[PDB]
């Protein structure tokens, strides 16, 4: 496989880890008894453990010799779920936040008191501006090609 790794579904170390983990919890549960609230909790915990390992097994994750999942991020779409797809999520959300923030600052900049509106936010306006960020990619590009995003050497600079 890529990098000499092995699929986790076919890695013995991965399975050994699972068995060991469950055993530890079960050994603890033995002390408590029957429907004792402590025992029921530990029992539920083993279920989650079994589920986690199963999910990873059914996945396309590749494990190493230690039996631990290793992520691939070279651009291959075979393992896009590991980095590329989640990556888009971050970019979309982050841009949303940044775009809306810039919009609000510029909007309140022309108000009676531009500094009071930064310490005491105008919630009504903020909410409106915040909702308009879902199309930030389009808006940003449009602003760039309209020479409204990047300024032109009319900004303060150092002495040298």
């Amino acid at each position: 496989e890529i990098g000499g790794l092995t699929k986790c579904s076919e890695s013995a170390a991965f399975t050994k880890r699972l068995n060991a983990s469950v055993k530890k919890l079960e050994q603890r549960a033995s002390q408590y008894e029957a429907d004792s609230p402590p025992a029921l909790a530990l029992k539920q915990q083993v279920e989650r453990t079994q589920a986690r390992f199963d999910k990873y097994s059914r996945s396309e994750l590749l494990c190493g010799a230690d039996g631990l999942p290793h992520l691939v991020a070279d651009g291959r779409w075979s393992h896009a779920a590991e980095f590329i797809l989640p990556g888009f999520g971050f970019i979309y959300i982050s841009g949303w936040i940044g775009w809306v923030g810039r919009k609000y600052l510029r909007a309140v900049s022309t108000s009676a008191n531009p500094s009071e509106s930064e310490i005491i936010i105008n919630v009504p306006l903020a909410l409106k501006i915040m909702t308009t960020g879902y199309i930030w990619p389009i808006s940003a590009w449009q602003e760039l090609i309209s020479n409204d995003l990047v300024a032109v050497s009319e900004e303060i600079t150092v002495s040298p």
Partner: protein
Amino acid sequence: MNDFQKYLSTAPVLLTLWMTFTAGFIIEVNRFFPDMLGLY
């Protein structure tokens, strides 16, 4: 009321509320969709 709303509109207060909401929703997502290291 108006004045109280202004206090509730102060930066510190709004941050706390927003972050509490954000933290909560993240926690809730993990409660119902737990243990994820990738989009499956």
